[PDB]
Amino acid sequence: MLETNCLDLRTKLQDLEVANQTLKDEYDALQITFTALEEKLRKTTEENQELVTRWMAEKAQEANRLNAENEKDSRRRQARLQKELA
Amino acid sequence: MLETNCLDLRTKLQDLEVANQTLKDEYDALQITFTALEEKLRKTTEENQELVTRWMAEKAQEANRLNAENEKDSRRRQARLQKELA
Amino acid sequence: RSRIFKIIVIGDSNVGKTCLTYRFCAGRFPDRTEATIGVDFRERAVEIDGERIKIQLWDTAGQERFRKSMVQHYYRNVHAVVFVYDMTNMASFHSLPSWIEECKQHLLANDIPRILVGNKCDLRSAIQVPTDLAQKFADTHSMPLFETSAKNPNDNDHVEAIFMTLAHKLKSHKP
Amino acid sequence: RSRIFKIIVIGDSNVGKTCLTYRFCAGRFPDRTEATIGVDFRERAVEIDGERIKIQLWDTAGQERFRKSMVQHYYRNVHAVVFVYDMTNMASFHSLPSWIEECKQHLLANDIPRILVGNKCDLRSAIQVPTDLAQKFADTHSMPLFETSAKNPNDNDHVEAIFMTLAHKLKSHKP
């Protein structure tokens, strides 16, 4: 309208509406999915941590075992080489 | 107010119009932080799947090997059984 | 030099497959368990009627994502199948038809013995699966039923007795 | 008679530690690698002066989260340390002082040989670390310098010749 009048109050009953079809409703309607997504993310992250920690633990136990085997064989060589003097 | 006048209505209007842009800003500040959180979850889930896939691949190779070693042992043992029926 | 019996253990996550198999091979309850990924192997040498036998238990995974592309390997040259549910969890008992369908679609011989084991019989105040239900299920599928406890290994059916019985039948090729 | 030399391989991610150790032990270049988690063990038996020697390489992890708990194990009873950088990556070269500091803080003896290796010498148009720089670093730290290529194992310093030279030095206890 080149010159607005009072009937242009339609805009009010057309703007009090559009806004409400989102804003305070949609704020919570995205807060819910956002907190949900937060929870999904922390679950997944937690899981990666447990997986990695488990893998690391098994590697530490294998490394420990191998160090112990090397040590045993080294003592064997030392004993044998002690036999080589008498 | 027991009887509303235009002053009361107008100050109500300005106040609502302030709260409106407030909640609007609060909305826009979360409509894309959601997109970012989306990306983070995507990446983390991706790492998750890589870790598991590599773990499962190792377990499958190990199971295959064990089956082969069992079969080897079986045919070995049954080879003993033919060099006694001589 | 010793004969190996490959015996696989199948069932839902958390019914106690790791604890059962470890209880049999190591003679202990585990300090802690975690979700089995792919498969764990536990062996124990026994003497049956004078013969030294290696019992080789495959503690399989029950989660879909942890058993992907493993099933061919589980079932390759398998000598016996042990199905397991949680006596305190009715859902784990209702899962058995799908496990059996997998077994049937993957076995390569018609003469592989299968048995059924309800675990955690020690948790009597929380049991969800009545003995007669499970018994009927097992009878109609040609499986013996055992009700047992990995945690308390002398309760009802002894763990040792389960696996030793199975191994005895394998060695004897008996019913 | 077969004595063992534990040799650890240390360095930033993606300098080619996995490819180097695999090239030496298996005699080929990997079809594919992934991030090394914890550590990987590769072993090769050789014969020096009639004696059978097992060269045991520890391909360590370069990422903090993947080496978290492991440094004590890496450095326990180690017989030699191999430091590795990427010749095409100057940052991998600037990392070396902190690797050396970790080493010095964890060695249990003052007589463990250390050597310095620049990898990916095949990529000549992308090299970022000039030989004379690397050489001065190596000399002032009492390390021999090798410039090598796991991908093309006969370029410049042969991958074979590196680990064999080190093994000879260890076996004879020579300087």
Ligand SMILES: Nc1nc2c(ncn2[C@@H]2O[C@H](COP(=O)(O)OP(=O)(O)O)[C@@H](O)[C@H]2O)c(=O)[nH]1
């Ligand atoms: N009370 C009781 N708990 C058990 C028994 N067997 C296993 N559990 C528990 O059930 C949970 C899962 O056990 P686990 O062996 O890892 O189950 P799996 O996923 O089938 O291998 C753990 O908390 C165990 O301690 C049992 O005989 N009695």
Ligand SMILES: Nc1nc2c(ncn2[C@@H]2O[C@H](COP(=O)(O)OP(=O)(O)O)[C@@H](O)[C@H]2O)c(=O)[nH]1
């Ligand atoms: N061109 C070239 N690339 C290499 C060489 N060695 C390793 N790479 C590549 O560098 C990347 C990292 O190798 P990797 O062994 O995984 O490094 P690491 O993390 O230190 O063990 C891989 O893409 C390799 O193919 C080399 O000698 N030449």
Ligand SMILES: [Mg+2]
């Ligand atoms: Mg388990």
Ligand SMILES: [Mg+2]
């Ligand atoms: Mg690597």
